[PDB]
Design a protein around this ligand. Structure first.
Ligand SMILES: O=C(O[C@H]1CN[C@@H](C(=O)O)C1)c1ccc(-c2ccccc2)cc1
Ligand SMILES: O=C(O[C@H]1CN[C@@H](C(=O)O)C1)c1ccc(-c2ccccc2)cc1
Ligand SMILES: O=C(O[C@H]1CN[C@@H](C(=O)O)C1)c1ccc(-c2ccccc2)cc1
Lengths: 442, 442, 442
């Protein structure tokens, strides 16, 4: 039934296109001048509503799916599957970062152009920042792993601010911990996996609880169906709002065309050559067919700019349409969302290479390897914190000591490049799931 | 067994009467002068303890009751029942507001009297307020519906504060969202209903989870029995404390006797003529008998001044004493608590008409319809936020542009009129439940 | 199998000893000068990680264990068991406080010595404090009992701050309530016990839910096994960090040797004479054998300085190694953690007697009884709040009006005496559990 099967894909693609058209027409016809902030809020509000709906269920779906997936195969096979999955995610993120270096080095987006100016963008506010240390970031990562409280971890994460409690002499900023807002999805993932392993360690005592969590996840999936049918309206209004919030006639594109083209080309090459090649090599099945199987979550990722929020739609589509195993999907895809960020590592490395290319920095071999490794680690470093969309580049440049004086340049265009990132991240998650499904099948 | 059956009703009526007597005697004998703030806190503390007990269980009871009630009848009948229930609540709230207009217009409580003075009450602090817009209130309503996180929604709700982030020129206050304290009971209600529909959409997978939630609610009901047996002491001490906290020899009654009489008469006429007439018309069963069946929750509502807190006692009494169906009770009465506020719409409209009557405003037909509709919507607008006992009148007067210069007059007497409101709200909920029980039975 | 059975006890004792050796060697070899704050954080971080792991599971384990234990015996036997348990805890805490008086009165640690000076310790900051009233502390105790919301009670507790809302004349600080951080484990304990009683009041409806909670606790116990195998590393690094954080060559020991010896001797006499004597008297079974059965939780208590955090390890060890009944363990030991603080009452009373001994206060009989009773109540008073490690001594001295001018003396050495306190508290809990197991068996 092609007509009914492909209705959703048609609807979300039409939603994205019509949202772009609506926003461009509104901005050309007057935009904010004809709109006002109140009508801007009402115009963006369906987008915020879709993101509120999809952030409501990631906690149930992630927790109960991992508990229902971990306790479906014995811990030996689970350990092997988790290890090969982490290896796959690490390799894909590393390949993405290397592709970013190879593109930004060649196209040279940091050539002398309008982007050389940065007074308007920075205006002295770029240097002023928390300036989180790399060690403190890794410690906050390993403290969001192994949370102090599960309930608080359902909406809070650990962030190490810096006070000035060294009045005795030579004032040095000292760390203090204070829980902030944002889900600790990594901690919940680890707790859930460990829980499911514990239930598999038990036998008849755990059958009730596995049945509970599987039923709960199936109910949440039934909610996901209806959220999916709502999603095109939210995507349309969200995209229209996010191109009405700033003019996009071509001024910022004319400013940063090489950088944005480098990022989008890197994302497409990662998402249409590298990972499809890996899938074909390993499972020997049509990767582009599979990519068409998941267009609706990809479009939702482009519209939402949030990997965790698109995940319920993705797990529904992957388990339903494509012939991916239910337990493998449950175990892999949430872990893919919180660890695999191919696009994030890609455009972080490309941004670093761009800001280094302007001012003519060297970056011969050692610094290249450094940016690769720290991008690969920051793939998960940025994952626990939702606020740090591109904030993690500052700590990278602190590690390797580059000019952070114009990091605010990307914040004007973060809302565009970070969407293709989300597309590629969920794509890499699904491809890892398919590969590991075939590996477990063999 | 009349002697044992009616013991609780006797006990709570005696508790209210003895609390009034105790508070009046203490205030006459010296009150605070003989008491001190520390003994005032210890004297009110049983009231705070009862409210802490009854706010502990509304989350379990509401969530699990709606999940156990929604998934007891098919979604078609559920949709019809929900639609006729919302229609009933809307009509009753609208009739209440019209009754408020009809009374305040006739009795004319805003005649020239001591209430004309407002310097002592306002003293310039009335105008200073957040001044929340109507659109922003509706957006916060629809964002507390569809919460971002369920756990946070168990004790937090979305409130749009206003910052001054327009330093570029012509400083205009802009909205920012920051979650504040207070349960998001509307969001939990909607999520729970949707969940129960999902479990009914499933079949054998959901039987475990329905059995879980029904067992959990029955346990919470067993707690409610013991809280009910404690409740008269809390009501007595609470009422005594809340008339010791301000002198009530008759000064404020002598000031606002017409307004308070208008509100109480409107509440009694709504609760003893209109809704009993509707019940008799539809189900043809003794409505006043049924009203006597629920005296203990009504007295608890008068003592507590909180509709959500009396709800566990109400659902216990309605399912136990009166022959109302268990599933219909579960589905309707929580929704009645968070949506139906007949008394709130009533005294909000009466307060508006009173402040308009002083200063001799017109309010011919269009403004009357405006106050009716905005009161009907604010019935649920005030429901998500517990702090806004009468705060929502300011946004109404912002919509229709009346003198808010003396809104602080009612805050001295909010603690009295708002209790009969709670009585009428729970009464309207129970009457809707009885009507819809008979409709489903037919 | 002695070699495998005793491996854990050997490992944690070796961990404590090696941590002491590591910290002393690091402090002697340069300590902070060779370390820096960043490496100090990385060196302490395994300790923080162990405490984050053990605070993650006390909520599941406590809640589900009490629900699974309360609903294993009928409410009559439960009421008797709870009453005799509270009587036992009260008597043991009182005996501990009397032992503290008897030791501090005899050894006279407040003799004229270096400890007479307090300018360096206090420096005027001792008097400045919230100065919480005793009545307000008891009210906050009874409001953390019977929480307003269960979810918030999973990570928040009620603390009555004091504002200055008496500008009308004679500015007097007035209480305001605002929820702060810290688990409301007492409120969750009471709610859980009451819930389990409700499920036992029900019959077949509750079997599912009891099976759920028992399965959930068994899963959490399976997590506890692995946390236990990790624990020695955390204890070693934590102890090393907490003796590197301050020099302990003997300066503070040379300052307060009599006071610390009094506290440790009181703890050992309570833990090795009084309670073993009671156990032998009642159950007639080798108490020192039983004490050896639980060395790993005792060492964890010494390392962690947290009674609640060691509790999962304790309940695992008591149910596994020693022949204590599962249901009795579940019901008693969590209640022991939140109520029984023998060591806390002990060193609080000893600290009071020490600060009274300096400056030559009388403390004849009435004040002795007062310190005993308020210490016995503050055993649970300090339990709800985790921040108040020794903060509760100030409110005691407010009750009985002693010099609080040098309360900051103990804060330098709170990290040492408060560890043996934790050891004795968990010891008293386990001994009460064994006694009541034998009583129920008889
Ligand atoms: O850390 C993240 O990733 C960054 C790198 N790529 C971008 C992406 O694709 O998300 C962002 C992140 C994840 C999720 C959310 C999120 C947003 C709305 C609602 C709920 C959650 C934000 C930030
Ligand atoms: O918004 C509400 O309604 C207003 C209009 N009528 C009044 C009523 O009857 O409650 C108030 C509201 C509901 C519930 C609480 C509440 C109070 C204590 C504890 C827990 C909850 C407060 C305010
Ligand atoms: O109030 C308490 O007791 C005091 C008297 N003796 C001391 C003890 O043995 O704990 C402290 C308390 C309990 C538990 C924690 C706690 C610490 C870390 C992580 C989680 C929790 C703190 C303070």
């Amino acid at each position: 039934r092609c007509l009914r099967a492909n209705l959703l894909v048609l609807l979300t693609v039409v939603a994205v296109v019509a949202g772009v058209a609506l926003g461009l027409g509104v901005s050309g016809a007057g935009g904010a001048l004809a709109l006002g902030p109140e009508r801007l809020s009402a115009f963006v509000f369906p987008g915020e509503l879709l993101l509120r709906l999809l952030r409501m269920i990631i906690l149930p779906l992630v927790v109960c799916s991992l508990i229902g997936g971990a306790a479906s195969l014995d811990p030996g096979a689970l350990g092997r599957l988790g290890a090969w999955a982490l290896l796959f995610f690490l390799v894909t993120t590393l390949l993405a970062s290397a592709l970013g270096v190879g593109l930004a080095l060649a196209l040279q987006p940091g050539a002398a152009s309008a982007a050389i100016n940065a007074s308007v963008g920075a205006a002295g506010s770029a240097e002023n920042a928390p300036s989180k240390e790399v060690l403190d970031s890794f410690l906050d990562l390993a403290r969001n792993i192994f949370p102090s409280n599960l309930v608080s971890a359902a909406f809070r994460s650990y962030s190490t601010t810096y006070e000035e409690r060294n009045i005795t002499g030579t004032r040095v900023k000292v760390p203090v911990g204070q829980e902030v807002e944002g889900m600790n999805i990594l901690g919940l993932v680890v707790f859930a996996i460990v829980f499911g392993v514990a239930l598999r360690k038990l036998g008849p005592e755990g059958e009730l609880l596995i049945r509970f969590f599987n039923s709960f996840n199936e109910a949440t999936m039934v909610l996901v169906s209806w959220i999916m049918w709502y999603a095109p309206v939210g995507i349309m209004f969200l995209v229209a709002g996010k191109i009405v919030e700033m003019e996009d006639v071509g001024l910022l594109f004319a400013r940063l065309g090489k950088y944005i083209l480098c990022c989008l080309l890197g994302h497409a090459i990662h998402g249409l050559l590298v990972l499809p090649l890996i899938y074909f090599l390993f499972t020997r099945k049509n990767p582009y067919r599979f990519l068409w199987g998941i267009v609706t979550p990809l479009a939702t990722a482009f519209g939402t700019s949030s990997s965790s929020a698109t995940l319920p739609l993705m797990m529904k589509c992957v388990e339903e349409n494509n012939g991916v195993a239910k337990h493998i999907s449950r175990f892999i895809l949430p872990i893919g969302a919180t660890v695999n960020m191919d696009g994030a590592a890609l455009f972080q490395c490309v941004a670093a290479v761009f800001i280094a290319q302007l001012s003519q920095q060297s970056l011969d071999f050692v610094k290249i390897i450094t940016i690769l490794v720290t991008a690969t680690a920051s793939s998960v470093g940025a994952a626990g914190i939702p606020a740090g969309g591109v904030l993690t580049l500052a700590i990278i440049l602190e590690a390797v000591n580059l000019p952070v004086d114009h990091i605010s340049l990307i914040l004007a265009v973060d809302w565009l490049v970070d969407r293709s990132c989300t597309v590629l991240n969920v794509e890499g998650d699904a491809l890892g799931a398919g590969l590991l499904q075939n590996y477990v099948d063999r």
